[PDB]
Amino acid sequence: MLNFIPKRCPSVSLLFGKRPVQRIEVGQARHQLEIPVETIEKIYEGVDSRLEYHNKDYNAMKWKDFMKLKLDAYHLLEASQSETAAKSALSDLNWFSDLADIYSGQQTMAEMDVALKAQGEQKLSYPIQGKNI
Amino acid sequence: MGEESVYKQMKKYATDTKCLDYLSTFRTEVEDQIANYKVALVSQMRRQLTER
Amino acid sequence: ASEQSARMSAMDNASTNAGEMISSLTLRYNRARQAKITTELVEIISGANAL
Amino acid sequence: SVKFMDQKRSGEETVYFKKEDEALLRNLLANHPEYDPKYS
Amino acid sequence: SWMSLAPFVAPNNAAAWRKLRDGAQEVQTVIERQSTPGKPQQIDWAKWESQIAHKDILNCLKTFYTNQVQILDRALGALETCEGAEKGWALFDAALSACAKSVEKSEELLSNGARALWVSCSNPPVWKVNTNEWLDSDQYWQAFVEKHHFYSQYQPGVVDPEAPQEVEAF
Amino acid sequence: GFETIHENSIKPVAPLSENSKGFVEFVNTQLEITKAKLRNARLTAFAHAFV
Amino acid sequence: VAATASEAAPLQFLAPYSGCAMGEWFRDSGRHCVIIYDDLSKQATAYRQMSLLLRRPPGREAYPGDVFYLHSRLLERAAKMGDKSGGGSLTALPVIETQAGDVSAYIPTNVISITDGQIFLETELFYKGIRPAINVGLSVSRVGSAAQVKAMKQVAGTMKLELAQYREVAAFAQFGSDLDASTRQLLTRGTALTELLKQRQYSPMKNSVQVCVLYCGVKGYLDPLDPKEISRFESLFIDYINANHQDILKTIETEKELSEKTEAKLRAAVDEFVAMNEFKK
Amino acid sequence: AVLALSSDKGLCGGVNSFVAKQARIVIKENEMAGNAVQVYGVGDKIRSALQR
Amino acid sequence: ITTTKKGSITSVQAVYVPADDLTDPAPATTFAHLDATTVLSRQIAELGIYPAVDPLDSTSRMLAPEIVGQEHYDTARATQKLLQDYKSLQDIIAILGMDELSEEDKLVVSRARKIQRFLSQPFTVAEVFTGKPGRFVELPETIKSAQTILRGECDDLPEMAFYMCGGLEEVRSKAVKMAQ
């Protein structure tokens, strides 16, 4: 991709932010994709307005942000190309132990908040030979 | 080809936000599954006593 | 040529094994025939003597 | 030997005549267009 | 819904998860069982007082029964309306925190991918774009051209002068 | 033929990671503080049936 | 109703009739019932014993001639009554042990000639890995689809056709010959279904779950998958549809059919499951 | 490149067996040193023998 | 003969089979009363295998995974499948030969012959007419050996190296000594 962000002025991009969504066709099959206008507006914080190209209708981003975007694209692409890719982008998960511990803890705390109530044990009546019989 | 690969890999990971509201449901559920666990334990004790 | 020679040899061996199996099955057939005859005849006799 | 030979024969015939029926279904409508309902 | 959290497990975090899962399975195997028949036991002493001749220990046994069932129903209706659990709910909230942070950065990744797709689909055709404008936009391949065509004068005018074919030919 | 709860059927927690220790310990401690107490409230009954 | 070996011959003779008497209460009182006579040949053995000790003359293999009137009396009491007689039923599932697979014998032949179906069981299939070892070629059911749900008809027709083709072709295929793809697909689907119909003992399944599993097997979600993996593909899939898709099962249980909505929902659920999980192919 | 000649009918004894044996020997001998091997064949028997 | 709440009788009955006919009424009736079975055969004894147990006609009620483990259950069922697949080729091997078979079938036949010869044990009481000493064999060693033979970790060895050896270390030592 190029570092050419269209100006959101209506003289260039009519009806940019009139609705809260943008849409695009992707690839040779032209799959549809809808993007929030806020996700798109995030770009115009990195956009640099000194630079204007192609009839002065496209600005350029700062190289840091543009290359971050490129690297994210490249990572997704190479993950698609590789076979040992993670099934999720939700990095190393390490909060299943705490869940197990609190589950066992609540289970035990219920099991032993029961038998405080279910063992009042006022008195008992044991039949004993010679006396109760 | 690049657009298609990125698109499909994002489709692959579109599901990765429901982990939170699955979790969120953990605290809401287990604090009801326990109040509907103590009851069943009581009734277990009753049943065992009666059968004995 | 080697294929055809091996084919002839295999047909020879198969015919020999088939002859052996035919001999064995003939023995078994005669045994089963005698068994059937004896069983049917004992059935008939026991039904004739059970009156 | 009996079920063996019978099933082998059945499978071989099935495959052979499946191929032959595929070929005939390919080459039918050309040589017999009066039957093709595409042209009727 | 939290039962559909399986595929986000990893083999380093597998046995723990399985433990948790089997725990919950145990709980449900209790609960459904001890609420399916309801109350079919409900023994009736009218039968046994008649069918039995002693009627001296049966009475005390029945007394024990009716004395325990009272306290059972008492505890039941009492629980059927803290701090001991917050010390673990804090662990849960920390996990919630870190899970939200992971979801946040993964959403940032996918948002950047969507932004890249939007930029690519909104770009002009690169053969329509002016070459010098492209090179002014791009700061990396600027350095690639200076390296081979400003710092040298005899490098070939190929797209990739650093490639293995070029290196080995040299 | 009486049915009394066997307290030892309760099982304590197995620690997994260090971050849980501040919960697990409070559990297991309180569990002991309930197990022995309950034991007492059992055996006192067992004695006060027999005087 | 236990009429064991120590129990005398007349008790072994009368136990199945006692069971039919106990079932006629359900059959006549508007209720339903099912009765399983286990080791129904011991009844004929006991009747032979009684008649031979009562000096009645035998027939062939020492049995009397009244064996047909012995089993017809017993099995004709199974019936489906009308709406005026309550609407009850008494189903029968007799069991027979053959020797060396000889079903040309006298007792198997008699009982086969007076029944509305057959469920043959073989040791070759029992040791090959097919458990239950039901040979679906010889096994039949004259009632058939009338005793079968529409949702299960839709899948079982295709399954029977595919298994017929596989049984036809596999014997020739096993010689290592090279076949086209339309036949390789037949072999693959037949192997998939044969590995699907295996089951653990005392591990039955609901009808909706059977429908879902056979849908996964028939629409081609097991052809590329490895055979040995199916034994867990089943189990996991079951747990999945018992966890997150109870509504599909309730809908199939109630409507007893597969509308296009349930079709699409089941396809989506299978796709989600295959996405969430990974197997050797 | 290993060209293995074989037949298409069966009952040919074990000539195609010996052919495939020699071919396996050659392939396992030449693949150790690192020679990339390709396989041409004549007949279905060699294919059925060396497919797996 | 039955275990009760007082004690227990384990029972081991030897049942003759006249004229090698298992369809006789006496053994047919006796089959219904047994909890475990072991059917010996003359065709396997003529091969010199002892005990001449037919593992397909043999059966039991204590083979389910709820009694023995799942590794034991799976090994037993895999061995039974292998031996049945080998039995299914006896006719075509007798008529045509092993050369007609494919390679999977040849591997099956090899492993089936190997596990047949491995399921043979010299007893101690046979030392008077066999000479070779007795070999007690534990269950996990048998299970490991069967698993390895089914996997393919013993295809390199010969066929006569499994005859009357007990475990696998003896089989490998005999293969070593036969290499000379």
Q: E72 and B46 in contact by Cβ < 8 A?
A: yes
Torsion of Cα atoms, D26 then D32 then D34 then D38, to 10°: 10
Among residues G84, G93, G79, G75, which one has the least CA distance to residue G32? G79
**Catalytic one of G142, G167, G200, G267:** G142
Q: E13 and A96 in contact by Cβ < 8 A?
A: yes
Q: How far apart are CA I156 and CA I173, in angstroms?
A: 13
Q: How far apart are CA I79 and CA I56, in angstroms?
A: 10
Residues in chain F: 51
- Check CB contact of B43 with chain A, cutoff 8 Å: no
Q: How far apart are CA G214 and CA G233, in angstroms?
A: 12
Q: C7 and H13 in contact by Cβ < 8 A?
A: yes
Which helix (H) or strand (E) segment holds residue A5: the answer is strand A5-6
Bridge partners, I53 (sequence order): I40
Task: List CB contacts (< 8 A) between C6 and chain H.
Answer: 12-15
Q: G touches D (3+ CB pairs < 8 Å)?
A: yes
- Check CB contact of I156 with chain H, cutoff 8 Å: no
DSSP 3-state assignment of A72? helix
Q: How far apart are CA E108 and CA A64, in angstroms?
A: 16
- Check CB contact of G246 with chain E, cutoff 8 Å: no
Chains that touch D (3 or more CB pairs under 8 A): G, I
Among residues I94, G47, G191, G252, which one has the least CA distance to residue G269? G252
CA E108 to chain centre: 18
Q: Write phi, then psi, for F14 (nearest 5 degrees).
A: -100, 120
DSSP 3-state assignment of A11? coil
> Do the annotations mark residue G38 as ligand-binding?
yes
Sign of CA dihedral G118, G123, G129, G131: positive
Q: Around Cβ A16, how many Cβ atoms within 10 Å?
A: 17
- Tell me which DSSP letter residue F18 carries: G
Task: Establish, for the pair of chains A and E, how many residue pairs have beta carbons separated by less than 8 Å.
Answer: 170
For tokens 């004896």, name the residue.
Answer: C38
Q: Around Cβ E36, how many Cβ atoms within 10 Å?
A: 7
Mutation test of the interface with chain H: which of G174, G177, G179, G184, choosing the one with the most H Cβ atoms within 10 A? G177
Among residues G243, G158, G134, G258, which one has the least CA distance to residue G207? G258
- Check CB contact of B20 with chain E, cutoff 8 Å: yes
For tokens 């629409």, name the residue.
Answer: G219
Using alpha carbons only, give the angle C29, C33, C34 rounded to the nearest 5 degrees: 120
- Check CB contact of A92 with chain F, cutoff 8 Å: no
Q: What are the structure tokens assigned to G104, written together?
A: 């040309």
Identify whether G142 is a catalytic site residue.
yes
Q: How far apart are CA A27 and CA A29, in angstroms?
A: 5
- Check CB contact of B49 with chain E, cutoff 8 Å: yes
Q: H touches D (3+ CB pairs < 8 Å)?
A: no
Q: Å from F23 to nearest chain E CA? A: 6
DSSP 3-state assignment of I37? coil
Q: Write phi, then psi, for B7 (nearest 5 degrees).
A: -60, -50
- Tell me which DSSP letter residue A26 carries: E
> Do the annotations mark residue G165 as ligand-binding?
no
**CB under 8 Å to F44, separation ≥6 — which residues?**
none
Q: How far apart are CA C3 and CA H12, in angstroms?
A: 5
* Domain span holding position C28: 11-51
Q: E88 and F1 in contact by Cβ < 8 A?
A: no
Q: What are the structure tokens assigned to A99, written together?
A: 């869940």
Q: How far apart are CA I115 and CA I71, in angstroms?
A: 17
Q: Around Cβ E39, how many Cβ atoms within 10 Å?
A: 9
Which helix (H) or strand (E) segment holds residue E153: the answer is none
Q: How far apart are CA A49 and CA A51, in angstroms?
A: 5
Alpha helices in A42-131 (DSSP H): 43-46, 63-81, 96-114
Q: How far apart are CA E163 and CA F16, in angstroms?
A: 52
**CB under 8 Å to I105, separation ≥6 — which residues?**
G174, G176, I89
Alpha helices in B1-52 (DSSP H): 2-13, 18-33, 35-51
- Check CB contact of A38 with chain F, cutoff 8 Å: no
Q: How far apart are CA E88 and CA A97, in angstroms?
A: 12
Identify the experimental approach: cryo-EM
Among residues G280, G160, G186, G175, which one has the least CA distance to residue G232? G280
Q: Is E114 left (phi over 0), alpha (psi -120 to 50) or beta?
A: alpha
Q: Is C12 exposed, middle or buried (0-12, 13-18, 19+ CB in 10 A)?
A: exposed
List residues in chain E that are followed by a break over 2.5 Å (C to N): 81
Mutation test of the interface with chain I: which of C12, C15, C17, C31, choosing the one with the most I Cβ atoms within 10 A? C17
Q: G177 and H44 in contact by Cβ < 8 A?
A: yes
Peptide bond into G132 cis (omega under 30): yes
For tokens 């199939």, name the residue.
Answer: G252
Q: E56 and A100 in contact by Cβ < 8 A?
A: no
Q: E31 and B44 in contact by Cβ < 8 A?
A: no
Q: What is the DSSP string of G66-106?
A: THHHHHHHHHTT--B--TTTTS-B-EE------STT--SSH
Which A residues 68-87 touch E at CB under 8 Å?
A: 68-70, 72-73, 75-76, 87
Q: How far apart are CA I132 and CA I165, in angstroms?
A: 10
Task: List CB contacts (< 8 A) between H47 and chain G.
Answer: 178
For tokens 């709440």, name the residue.
Answer: I5
Q: Which of H11, H14, H52 sits opposite I103 (nearest CB)?
A: H52
**CB under 8 Å to G216, separation ≥6 — which residues?**
G222, G233, G237, G270
Q: I95 and C10 in contact by Cβ < 8 A?
A: no
Q: What are the structure tokens assigned to G123, written together?
A: 């040791």
Q: Are A76 and B10 in contact (CB under 8 A)?
A: yes
Q: F touches E (3+ CB pairs < 8 Å)?
A: yes
Task: List CB contacts (< 8 A) between F1 and chain B.
Answer: 52
Among residues F31, B38, B47, F7, which one has the least CA distance to residue E68? B47
Q: How far apart are CA F22 and CA E154, in angstroms?
A: 70
- Tell me which DSSP letter residue E2 carries: G
Torsion of Cα atoms, I76 then I78 then I84 then I90, to 10°: -120
Sign of CA dihedral D10, D16, D19, D22: negative
Q: D15 and G171 in contact by Cβ < 8 A?
A: no
Q: How far apart are CA H4 and CA H24, in angstroms?
A: 11
